[PDB]
Amino acid sequence: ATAAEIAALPRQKVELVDPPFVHAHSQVAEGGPKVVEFTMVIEEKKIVIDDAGTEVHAMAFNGTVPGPLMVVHQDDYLELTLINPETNTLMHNINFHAATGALGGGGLTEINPGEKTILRFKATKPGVFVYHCAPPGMVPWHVVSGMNGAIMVLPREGLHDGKGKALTYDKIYYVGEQDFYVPRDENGKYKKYEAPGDAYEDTVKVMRTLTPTHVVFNGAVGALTGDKAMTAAVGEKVLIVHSQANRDTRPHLIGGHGDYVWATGKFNTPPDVDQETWFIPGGAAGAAFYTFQQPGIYAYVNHNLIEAFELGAAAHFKVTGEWNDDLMTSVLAPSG
Amino acid sequence: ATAAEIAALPRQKVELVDPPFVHAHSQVAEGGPKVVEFTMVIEEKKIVIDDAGTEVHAMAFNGTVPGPLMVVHQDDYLELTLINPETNTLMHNINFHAATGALGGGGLTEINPGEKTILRFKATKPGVFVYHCAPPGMVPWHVVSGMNGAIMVLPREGLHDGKGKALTYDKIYYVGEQDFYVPRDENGKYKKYEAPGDAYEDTVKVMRTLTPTHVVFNGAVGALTGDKAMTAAVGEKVLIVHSQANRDTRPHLIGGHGDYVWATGKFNTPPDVDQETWFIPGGAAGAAFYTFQQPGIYAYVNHNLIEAFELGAAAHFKVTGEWNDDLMTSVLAPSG
Amino acid sequence: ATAAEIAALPRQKVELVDPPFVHAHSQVAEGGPKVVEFTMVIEEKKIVIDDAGTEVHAMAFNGTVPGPLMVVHQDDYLELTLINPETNTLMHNINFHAATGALGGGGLTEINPGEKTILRFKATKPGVFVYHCAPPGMVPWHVVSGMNGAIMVLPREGLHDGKGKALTYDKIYYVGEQDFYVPRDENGKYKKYEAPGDAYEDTVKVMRTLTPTHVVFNGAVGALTGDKAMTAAVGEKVLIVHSQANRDTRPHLIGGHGDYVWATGKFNTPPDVDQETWFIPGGAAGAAFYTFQQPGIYAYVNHNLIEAFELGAAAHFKVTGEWNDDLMTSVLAPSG
Ligand SMILES: O=N[O-]
Ligand SMILES: O=N[O-]
Ligand SMILES: O=N[O-]
Ligand SMILES: [Cu+2]
Ligand SMILES: [Cu+2]
Ligand SMILES: [Cu+2]
Ligand SMILES: [Cu+2]
Ligand SMILES: [Cu+2]
Ligand SMILES: [Cu+2]
Ligand SMILES: [Cu+2]
Ligand SMILES: [Cu+2]
Ligand SMILES: [Cu+2]
């Protein structure tokens, strides 16, 4: 496509929504190729990641951890206006694993506080992909400070299983998993810092142990529980998009399954089926499609149970509906 | 199926056998759907896991670590009678990754010492699946104390390769891999405790490092080596079911391969072929099919060689038969 | 084939080249089955792995880390002459994951300093496979000292996608990833030893932590950058073979993708497509096929960014050619 043909394409401005929600979109593409426009302001901010009050000097796209999920269709163009407010102190940029060239866009988006840039790339490959900041000299630090998210490039024809049959979800949720490495003092207590820079040296030491102090969904322990628990109903089809820009994870829906799982996150790669626990490597996004068959509370976790229950990697799904005794029933309740 | 149709289904009691062995079963289903009945008594007991007398207060389904392998066919019902003797001191339950609803059955099987419960679930998805105890608030602890196992839900038509060609094994083994986190004193000696709960705090501290002190098969270092090595003969087709309820593993048959490997452990997902080393994520089970071609001793290991030879993740296969010089031969034996 | 039939097969002597380059070969088999001959001399030498002068007493096949990549075709016979110089002090052998029998050849190739041996095996399974030393009693040690490599067993008819379409690469590179566990003194400084055996004890304690001090490509930090960066040009098809003999890895081409990826490294297992980041379990090799579309410098890393940018797992690709504004363009360059 020439610059003229591209400039002639229709454009649609999209308003991003905070994770785990996803902005309105059409599973099946509307018309031909479009230039989808997104805008994100980078915010360096202090966030609390657990009930104890542990602090992290986050570097958040659109002000959230993970950054929001941008959705486009294959062969559409994603035009991102990225802003780094003069209130920030570090240089930032963005790298789309979905894009091709200049380190995923990182080599063309280096912006200092008080600057902005607009990047456009053709979404040539369908699937879910990770995106993260990557400043030459402190890549891992920025990413484990929460500066990452994901995008979804849907086939123009929507989703299908490995045999041509359509897969249409009723709901979609984006679970961004984050590994945090918070310094501790001699008492084993998490340390606090005045500015993000102050924590760098101590943090790097923790990072080198390759042992995160916290592994959380949506920026904090329990962030997707209670009133923030995700929801569904028996019969409802749900697509759960999951990303981890730095460390491996192994998603598992307790009480359920991944009926169709694109574990590698790429739609032209047939999804695995009837999965109990799938695997997403650090630096990637994956997606699972499931039709709920039983009501009740479900937990969605990274299945290294220590990471799930001791480190923070557990979310909840509240599901309404009629219980199915054929699928499961208590013949004899706990009794003497 | 109607209420009457389900109640009319044949009920069959099956006696379990200890791992790595598997109870008698047929690969191709014999007759229509059945309600297969199993009973397991829970045992809390101290076990030694290495040659240094290191102890673990194990929580074992049916008295073994891993728990035994239950085998049923797709659409059969698995009805488990779970017993927690008055001699035990902890609460227990069971979570079947193969089941649908109530956290895999955990929310319906919480039993205190002196109680029993009967759970029935329809095995709707074919594959090998992990099962483990999962008491709200103490999941990882009981799981890494050995309270986990697996089940195999065979297709009613038996196993087949990605092309539809049947795969019939002559024998089957179940290797359950366990990550243990044993506390050590300031001198580096593993500590001993009077009761399970006494070790809780120290153990959780070790668990948080995400670094197991031991990684073993069948509950102890060397449990499947020497005189307890598994066996086979040249020409024999063997299915090796492998599980890890909490941590990733990478099985490898030294000297052999995984001719067909359902790495995700699910039969409707085509198996990978000619595998050197496969990957099973924590929270799942997988299965490898291999036809032995050469006689001799083979080592079956988790291929992070430190976990295999330093931590204990190594088993052996003793194979009888005639050597094949076409496949391999020493043209010049070691010499000056 | 009988002994006589094999002895009648044509032989071909191959000259090995140092990684990341691969010795001359043909993608499509040039003629019928033959006995491909290779010779490697084991070199026990000191190598500096980082810019801090950190040393490792390496055990290297053919004098390099990783060992060179041997290329044959399915059903050819690989005849390796392994030599252990009198100048060496340790016992060595070789285990081919691609071979069938005697622990992959390790039980037939044990050679003391001043000895040699000739092993011949039939490459019956197509794909990339790991090969490494495995001295009963100290396995993990030699392997994590750099004594491992890989070989490639191409289909007779060359490479194909999942649908049978031919995949012909213009260039091929072999990246051997290595996890090192270097002991430190009480000041956190890496220690040096005058003899290999001298570091054994100290090394074993670091290995127990399952936390490498270094994770590198081709034996050292920055080894595959600058004067050793891999090259290509827009439109060129490149196959990137990657192996890890002891620990998991998740390769990612920054700015690009893995158009076709045999993640398990086995050719009869259909490759995944449009990959952002793939996964290779410790004890295996994988291969990715990509056609560069953009010029510029690309980074190739193990996508646990701490491992890549802090521990050393990073390589570079220098690509010449013209920039493609359709795929990516900076609508608005960084500005006020
Ligand atoms: O099934 N996860 O506890
Ligand atoms: O070749 N097995 O370590
Ligand atoms: O997108 N590679 O860091
Ligand atoms: Cu940034
Ligand atoms: Cu950054
Ligand atoms: Cu990245
Ligand atoms: Cu229990
Ligand atoms: Cu329990
Ligand atoms: Cu579970
Ligand atoms: Cu050696
Ligand atoms: Cu060795
Ligand atoms: Cu090996």
CB contact under 8 A, B328 and C116: no
Which two three-digit tokens encode residue B72? Answer: 């049923």
Chain B 107-126, residues with CB within 8 Å of chain A CB atoms: 107-112, 114-122, 124-126
CA distance linking residue B2 with residue B8, whole number of Å: 10
CA distance linking residue C179 with residue C144, whole number of Å: 6
CA distance linking residue A57 with residue A60, whole number of Å: 9
> Would you call A162 an interface residue with chain B, using a CB distance cutoff of 8 Å?
no
CA distance linking residue C229 with residue C309, whole number of Å: 16
- Helical segments of A193-277, H only: 196-207
**In sequence order, what are the residues at sequence separation of 6 or more whose Cβ sits closer than 8 angstroms to the Cβ of residue B138?**
none
Phi then psi for B43, rounded to 5 degrees? -125, 125
* Nearest ligand 3 atom, CA A130: 1
Q: Are C98 and C81 in contact (CB under 8 A)?
A: no
CB contact under 8 A, B333 and C144: no
Residue the block writes with tokens 């076409």:
B326
Q: What is the per-residue DSSP string for A184-202?
A: B-TTSPBP--SSHHHHHHH
Query: What residues does CATH 2.60.40.420 cover in chain C?
Result: 8-155, 156-322
CB contact under 8 A, A248 and C248: yes
Q: Are C262 and C271 in contact (CB under 8 A)?
A: yes
Ligand 1 within 6 A of B95 CB? yes
Assign A73 to helix, strand or coil.
Answer: strand
* Nearest ligand 1 atom, CA B95: 1
Nearest CB neighbour to B303, from listed C110, C120, C283: C283
> What stretches of B97-196 adopt beta strand conformation (E)?
115-122, 127-132, 148-154, 171-180
**Angle, vertex CA A335, rays to CA A333 and CA B2, nearest 5:** 25
Ligand 2 within 6 A of C99 CB? no
CB contact under 8 A, A296 and B101: yes
Residue nearest to atom 1 of ligand 3 (CA): C254
Strand partners for C121: B328, C78
Compute, in angstroms, the gap from residue B276 CA to the centroid of ligand 10. Answer: 20
Phi then psi for B85, rounded to 5 degrees? -55, 150
| Chain C interface, best mutation among B184, B253, B305, by max C CB count within 10 A | B305
List of chain A residues whose C-beta atoms are within 8 Å of the C-beta of residue B124:
327
Residue A140 host element (H or E): helix A139-143
Torsion angle of alpha carbons A153, A158, A161, A162, nearest 10°? Answer: -70
Whether the bond into C155 is cis, omega within 30 of 0: no
The answer to the question of whether B97 is labelled as a binding residue is yes
Q: Which CATH class is domain B8-155?
A: mainly beta
CB contact under 8 A, A334 and B117: yes
CA distance linking residue C271 with residue C262, whole number of Å: 4
> Would you call B1 an interface residue with chain A, using a CB distance cutoff of 8 Å?
yes
Assign C204 to helix, strand or coil.
Answer: helix
Q: Are A92 and A42 in contact (CB under 8 A)?
A: yes
**In sequence order, what are the residues at sequence separation of 6 or more whose Cβ sits closer than 8 angstroms to the Cβ of residue B49?**
B55, B56, B180, B182, B214, B216, B219, B220, B221, B312
**In sequence order, what are the residues at sequence separation of 6 or more whose Cβ sits closer than 8 angstroms to the Cβ of residue C158?**
C27, C28, C29, C166, C167, C168
CATH domain B156-322 topology: Immunoglobulin-like (2.60.40)
Ligand 3 within 6 A of A203 CB? no
Q: What is the per-residue DSSP string for C74-105?
A: TT-EEEEEEEE-TT--S-B--EETTS-SGGGG
The answer to the question of whether C142 is labelled as a binding residue is yes
For the beta carbon of residue A291, count every other beta carbon within 10 angstroms: 17
Query: What resolution in angstroms, rounded to 1 decimal?
Result: 2.0
Expt. technique: X-ray
Radius of gyration of chain C (CA): 20
> Would you call A179 an interface residue with chain B, using a CB distance cutoff of 8 Å?
no
CA distance linking residue B12 with residue A259, whole number of Å: 29
